[PDB]
Design a protein around this nucleic acid. Structure first.
Lengths: 98, 230, 52, 110, 79, 98, 79
DNA sequence: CCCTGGAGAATCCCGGTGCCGAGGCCGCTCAATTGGTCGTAGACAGCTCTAGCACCGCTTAAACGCACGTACGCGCTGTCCCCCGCGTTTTAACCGCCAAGGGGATTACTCCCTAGTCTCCAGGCACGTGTCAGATATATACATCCTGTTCTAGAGCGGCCGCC
DNA sequence: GGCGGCCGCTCTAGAACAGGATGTATATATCTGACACGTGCCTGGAGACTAGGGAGTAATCCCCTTGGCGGTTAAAACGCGGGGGACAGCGCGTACGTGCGTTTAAGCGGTGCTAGAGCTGTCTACGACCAATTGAGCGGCCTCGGCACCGGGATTCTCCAGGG
């Protein structure tokens, strides 16, 4: 036979429409939870984090990365491109002052 | 179990086709062989098997048309003694009786009819400034009250034909056309332009309508201005 | 938010609808521009050059 | 979408607009001249609105209708392409061509 | 705890880009996004760490995270 | 006889060095002062501004516009471009949130 | 007072971009930044108008200009 | 086409003025400093109890990795129309100087509701529970995208015809 | 009799149209889990009262921004010459889109326990407030000096022309 063989980019907008209308959390909780502990280990060895405390940190980081990805994305069309680059991210942080 | 087991030409069926979607499988029992995976999937599927010129007097005619329409506030006289059908008929008979007859009469009349229906279907779509739109409107309603289909050919002057000739490069460049037909149309256009050149005295007579009845132009009134540019 | 709830056939207010209501309003968007909304997502908008 | 520029004579006045078209027209700058006292009811659509979302582009889409149109209209093919392009064009006022502006430097567009 | 910056996996970063409307995702953006996320987390958590020590508490609560995000103009609703 | 005929860009770079090391304000006071009164007259009539009030408003306006111009400049070289564009300014405002 | 947006002249915008390190300036840039400056001025002055009306004063002081810029994260030093 | 010598003009170091803003001085006066005195927030000691840290089973959707190819990133060419450098003639900018009259800044008389309580009670909060909209689930069903088949111009080629 | 022009034949193919494909939009069945109503309090604000103090208002005053001018040299603007670059276009490619094999940990549910934040007393120094006092910050004046201004001179990095 012959598979359907979706063209490169068609599934990209399909994932764009799905994640822009559903509010599920894309990052898994446990990998983000353990990353918080190793970051906070450099500031305080004997430290604990609540279940809702890690919950509050994750959505703030998720929305910040998505907003950064939004500024990263429209920089490509400004640069006559469709692919995000690390120099586009450094463009976004410098303009935003971060 | 296993790696390749199918009754038809196998594609590494495991008791599942690898590289294919899950809901394409079959689980019936028939005579299944390997044959080194149909001899390496049959040798890997058998080893992948436009410029137009206008004379300066005529360009002066268009620019003083523009001056009379927008600045001097003068619109064309509808009951003119000369209509565009008379212009094209005089063109056709004059150039038929001037030269010989080698077969040019066929495409001559073809161009005449094509220009006639082009002027019929292009009077109010490229031409006709907003000042004379209500002129055209009152022509259409005065013909609709008479139960007669109104044609622009019988009543309009050749100045609007000159306007169509002036905007002909824009319409030609905006359409996909053959090269030979375009050059033939250009040659006929230039022939019409030199015909208008030699008959320039008796066709576009410069007259002021402020003191003459017939000057192929009439003047705008106050209510005309208020309903046109209001 | 109640108007946005009727857009997706919902009769209960969900934080997705609250985020949709805030960002849709032109005055509310720049007022809460420095405000993060949890379980709300972003507006489902696609650039013109992205569509094939 | 609506505009307040009326891109048929670049002037102002009484405007009408289409639902799916962002171009505005006056009551006089149209192929059918219509008065506000007897304006048609329902939706109003332009000529290329009738050419884009309506017949010859939705059903019986413009595959080769120009050539069979030429065959139908008794071989006016040196003008039949312009007759076809008449339907796929919005009505507008006359505007002087660009190459007439260069030969007379004394006149400038207002 | 070591090797935890790789917890933000390749499809996890791709899913974040899909929420942001990104059509094409480069292979070099995963290291860049991890560094930006680590930099952003090193400021919010450290600010929340100072809030935790001042409150005479040894566990970080969600209330201090809101206060840490508020002073940087990134206030979070719903805690 | 032959004129100097400086190529474009070098004097532009020279003007960059002369104005980045300068202190004085580039925009004249009187054109900027009259613009402030025209804008304020649409909000409240019979309103006066002090000389130091316009002076404080003018310094902040230049610094905000300069910081926008720097972000416009690095956006151009990000897009493999030398000359800034009006679409670059619109990009800078959206990323900055203004 | 009319047509006061033309007070910001074309080389004045060019001089501002020379301070910003801009190499070349497009001709459509000047019309764009005039609207940007007008939008920025329409927010600070309006905020300073509320500051002036709150103090029962008829003239806008430089103190009110600083507070108008301070609340938007654009604080000015030296008044 | 690339490397190197000489010179036009913007730029940098330096001698001399002096000048107008900065440094130090005169009081003194209003905010900074000293001592006592309580209501009161805070550090400290014991209880606890509800939420987090650590490990287990599995299972399953999430994730690492390999094969293939086409949308797109990047390298290279032209160009022309968009923008810079400079001559020229206006043009408004600011210091020079002058009134001015609304208006910012300061002082006092006086007025009302906010600082501070007593009491309570009707709205507000914790707890218990019937309940009503959301999610799981799957055949059915939209729904647009990709791909296979096709329908007639467009161009190339060859046969036929008139002329020298 | 040979050759250019004209028209029919045939290969190529641009792109609309129909069918398969796979992930979602709906159509119930049913769980389900917080949602809001009811109840029972119970803790915080409202009626009412005591006293007072900071602004509204009036007056003064002096101050300071606006209008309104000549002047003149800095420069905006118009226009000519021209110059290098944004974008249209084409080609190379590799690297990231898509598809799944395969491993691998996220998460649900469960168990145990202590790390520790409220909670309740308890006792204890601490800062607002009240007399009492006091000492250099600051308005302003005298002095003074660092660099703007004005030119003079100069090295110093840049462009145009000549040679290989």
């Amino acid at each position: 036979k012959k598979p359907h063989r979706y063209r490169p980019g068609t599934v990209a907008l399909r994932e764009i429409r799905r994640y822009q209308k559903s509010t599920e959390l894309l990052i898994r909780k446990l990998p983000f939870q353990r990353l918080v502990r190793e970051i906070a280990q450099d500031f305080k060895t004997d430290l604990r984090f609540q279940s809702s405390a890690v919950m509050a940190l994750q959505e703030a980081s998720e929305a910040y990365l998505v907003a950064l990805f939004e500024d990263t994305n429209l920089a490509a069309i400004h640069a006559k491109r469709v692919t995000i680059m690390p120099k586009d991210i450094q463009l976004a942080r410098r303009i935003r002052g971060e | 179990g296993g790696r390749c087991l199918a009754f038809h030409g196998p594609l590494m069926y495991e008791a599942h086709y690898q590289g294919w979607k899950s809901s394409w499988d079959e689980w019936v029992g028939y005579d299944r062989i390997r044959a080194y995976n149909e001899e390496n999937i049959a040798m890997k599927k058998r080893l992948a098997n436009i410029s137009l010129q206008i004379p300066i007097k005529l360009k002066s005619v268009l620019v003083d048309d523009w001056e009379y329409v927008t600045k001097d506030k003068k619109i064309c006289r509808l009951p003119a003694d000369v209509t565009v059908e008379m212009v094209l008929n005089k063109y056709e008979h004059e150039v038929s009786q001037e030269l010989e007859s080698p077969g040019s009469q066929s495409q001559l009349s073809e161009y005449c009819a094509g220009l006639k229906l082009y002027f019929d279907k292009c009077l109010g779509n490229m031409l006709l400034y907003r000042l004379e739109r209500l002129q055209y409107d009152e022509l259409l309603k005065k013909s609709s009250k008479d139960q007669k289909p109104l044609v622009p050919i019988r009543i309009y002057g050749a100045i609007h034909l000159l306007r169509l000739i002036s905007v002909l490069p824009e319409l030609i460049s905006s359409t996909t056309m053959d090269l030979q037909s375009c050059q033939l149309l250009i040659k006929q256009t230039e022939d019409f332009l030199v015909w208008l050149l030699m008959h320039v005295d008796e066709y576009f007579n410069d007259k002021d309508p402020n003191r003459s009845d017939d000057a192929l132009y009439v003047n705008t009134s106050s209510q005309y201005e208020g309903v046109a540019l209001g | 938010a109640g108007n946005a709830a009727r857009d997706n056939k919902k009769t209960r207010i969900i934080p997705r609808h609250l985020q949709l209501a805030v960002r849709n309003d032109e005055e509310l968007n720049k007022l809460l521009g420095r405000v993060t909304i949890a379980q709300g997502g972003v507006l489902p908008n696609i650039q013109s050059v992205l569509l094939p | 979408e609506n505009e307040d520029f009326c891109s048929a004579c670049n002037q102002s006045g009484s405007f009408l607009c289409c639902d799916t078209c962002p171009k505005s027209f006056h009551f006089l700058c149209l192929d059918p001249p219509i008065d506000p006292n007897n304006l048609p009811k329902g939706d109003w659509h332009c000529n290329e609105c009738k050419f884009k979302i309506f017949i010859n582009n939705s059903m019986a889409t413009l595959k080769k209708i120009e050539s069979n149109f030429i065959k139908q209209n008794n071989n006016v093919k040196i003008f039949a392409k312009l007759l076809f392009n008449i339907d796929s064009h919005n009505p507008k006022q006359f505007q002087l061509p660009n190459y007439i502006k260069e030969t007379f430097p004394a006149v400038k567009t207002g | 705890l070591r090797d935890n910056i790789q917890g933000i996996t390749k499809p996890a970063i791709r899913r974040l880009a899909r929420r942001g409307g990104v059509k094409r995702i480069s292979g070099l953006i995963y290291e860049e996004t991890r560094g930006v996320l680590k930099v952003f987390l090193e400021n919010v958590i450290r600010d929340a760490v100072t809030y935790t020590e001042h409150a005479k508490r040894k566990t970080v609560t969600a209330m201090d995270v809101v206060y840490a995000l508020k002073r940087q103009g990134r206030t979070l609703y719903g805690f």
